[model samples]
Target chain A: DFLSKTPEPPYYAVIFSSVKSGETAERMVSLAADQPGFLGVESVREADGRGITVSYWDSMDAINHWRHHTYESYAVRVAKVDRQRLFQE
Target chain B: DFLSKTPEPPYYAVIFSSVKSGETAERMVSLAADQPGFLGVESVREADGRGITVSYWDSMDAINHWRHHTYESYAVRVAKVDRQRLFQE
Candidate 1:
C-alpha cells in the first residue's frame, strides 16, 4: 500500500495510484480526475521505481460521491482488465 | 482550530497554524518554518476568515529535533508575545 494524507478537521484525501510495469501513466491520472473526492491530485514516481498519487478533497461526502461513479467503475474494470493495481484511503 | 495534514507511514506532519486578530500572519508562518520537526510549510488564509499552516516532516525524530531548535524558540516567542493563536498537528 501507498501512503498519502490531507488536512485534518473536515478535510479529506483521496489517493489514486498504481504500480507500473510498463503501463501508461495517463490512465491513472485520468482515473483520479474522474473520481468523486477530488480536490487536487499529486503524482510522483521515485528513483526506486515506486509510484504514488495523492488527491485533496473538501469532505468525506465528496469522496463517496466519486467512489461509486460510473466512470470510476469502468476505470476499475480497465485496471483489472489491463493492469494490476492496489490502493488505500 | 485549523486543518492540516502529513504523509502516512514513515512520514510526519507538524501543523503550525494560528488565528489572527490584530497580529500579522507573517510571524506565525515564520515560526513554523523555523520549528524543529519542520520539513516544509504552507500558509493559507480562508476567504471567510481564518489562517492555516501545514508542514511535512520525514519522520517523528526529525520533527522533534526541529521542535526544540533555537530558531523555533525565538519564533515561538515572537508569535506568543504578539498574537493570540491556536493550532493542531
Candidate 2:
C-alpha cells in the first residue's frame, strides 16, 4: 500500500502508461529495453489490467531516437496500438 | 496497482520516499511547490502509511538549489526524516 518505488540515482525516468490488449508485456519490455541508448524499462500491472512501462534514457535525443524507430512504427500501426500521450514533470 | 502517474515531459523528476511521523504531507508538498523551478509535487499514501512525494523540476541545478535551502532544512530536521530517501528519473 506504500511507495515501493525507491529513489534512483541522477537519471531520467520515462513513465509510459498504455491501455492495450493485443500486445504482450514481455514483448513490450524486450522491445523497449533493446532500443538504442535504453538504460532500462520496468513494467507493472495493476489489478484492473492497466500497465505502465517506464524506460530510462540518458538524454532527450536518445528518447527521440527510439520514438522514430521503424520497428516502433510497425508496433504502433500493425499492432493496432495507437492513441498514446506523453506527460512531463 | 495501475500507474496513474503518466509520462512527464523532458524534465527532471525527483521521487522522494519517506517514512516519518509528526509531519503532515501537506507541508512537504507546499515546500516542494514553493521551491525555485519546482514544476509540481504529488503525494500518495498507501494503506501501510508509506508515502511518496514526487517533485518535478526544470533541471538538476534547480533541484540542487532547493536542497541547500533553510526551511527545507527545518522540515528535514524535525520530521522523523532520518530514514527518508530520494530517487531521480
Candidate 3:
C-alpha cells in the first residue's frame, strides 16, 4: 500500500477538499517532508481534479503554519490523530 | 501498494469526517468491493480513531445507496474521480 508511515499518534490531520480539480503537486508533498512536525501525506483527487489532500502533523502549530506556507483554494479539516494504524500491503 | 486499484475517472468519492473516533470497519470495505460500480477505497483515520475514510464509486446512485446501507456518524464528501494515481512501492 502506498499509505504513509506516520509517527506515534496524538497528531493532527489537515484535509484539503478542492474543487475544479483537487490536483495537488508532487513537489509540495516533498516540501512538507522537509518541515518540522511533518509526518507523511495521502493525496487522492477526482479525475476532474477535485479531491482531498491530507497531510499529517505532530502538532496544531505545524498544521496552522503549513497552511499559510502552501495555501489552498480548498477546504481544510483538522482533527486529532492519537491511535492510528495502516492496513497496508 | 495497499492503495486500491481504481478504474478511470468519472467516479465519485465519499469522505467520512468522524467525531470522537473515525474508526472505520473492515467488513464494510469488503462489502463495498462486492457492490457493482464500486471501484475501490482509501481509508486513513486519526490515531484517536477520529479520521476520514474515503470510498470511491462509479456513480452517484451507488454512493447514495451505500451510505444508508452502512451508515456513518462522520461527515461525507462526494466528488468526481476523473483521474487518480498512487505513488507507491
Candidate 4:
C-alpha cells in the first residue's frame, strides 16, 4: 500500500530490477531525489536480497540524466531500465 | 540489462513490490498474459525473497480489471499498486 505522490497520468517511470547485484535502495534514492523531474520512488528489498526500485519522472530527459549518472556506481546490477505507463485502481 | 519490450509512451504499469508473501512469477504471468491490454512484464526476485513485478498495460481500464480479479488471491501482499510514467534510456 505504498504509493508515491506523483502528478498525473502522463508521467514516466523507471523500473529497476536486479537478481543479485546490489543493496541499492538508499544510494539510488539519495541521488535521484536531488535530480530534476524526480517525483518519488517506491523501493523494496527482502532479507533474502531480491529488490526493485520504481522511480518516477516528468520526462525522458530526466530519466536519462539520472541513468547516466548512476549507471556506473551500480554497474554490478543488470539494471537496464525501461519506460511504462501508470498503474490504476 | 533487463527490459521488457513494452509499447511506446502513454502506456500503463503496475509496480508491484513485496517484502514477503509469495513466489508469484509463474502464476501471475500465466494469468496476466491472457488478459486484455497485457503487453509484457519484467519480473525478478531475490533468493532472499524480495520481489517486484512491473506489468505493462494499454490503459487503466485493463489494469483495474486485472486488479479486481487478482486482488483476493494476492491479498497477503502489501501491493496496492500505483501509476507512473515510463522509464527511458
**Residue B39, candidate 3: how far off, in angstroms?**
23
List the global CA lDDT of all models.
0.37, 0.42, 0.58, 0.56
Give the true-contact fraction for every prediction, in order.
0.00, 0.04, 0.00, 0.06
lDDT of 3 at A74: 47
DockQ of every candidate structure: 0.02, 0.05, 0.05, 0.13
lDDT of 2: 0.42
**Best of the two (1, 2) by DockQ:** 2
DockQ of the two-chain complex in candidate 2: 0.05
Expressed as tens digits, the lDDT of each residue in B62-87 for candidate 3 is: 86667668722443435444334433
Highest lDDT: give the candidate number.
3
Error of 1 at A59 (Å): 1.4
Q: Candidate 4: where is the Cα deviation over 4 Å?
A: A1-12, A17-29, A35-52, A57-89, B21-25, B71-89
Candidate 1, residues A1-89: lDDT per residue as tens digits?
Answer: 11123333344433232233335467655766676555455444434333333455565567556655621110010000111112222
- Candidate with maximal DockQ: 4
Expressed as tens digits, the lDDT of each residue in B1-89 for candidate 4 is: 44556555556656665444335657878888889888677666545445566776777689778877892111011122232333433
Docking class of 3: incorrect
lDDT of 4 by residue, A29-82 (tens): 789999988877766654534446677677767877887888211111111223
Between prediction 1 and prediction 3, the one with superior TM-score is 3
Each prediction's number of clashing residue pairs:
6, 10, 20, 19
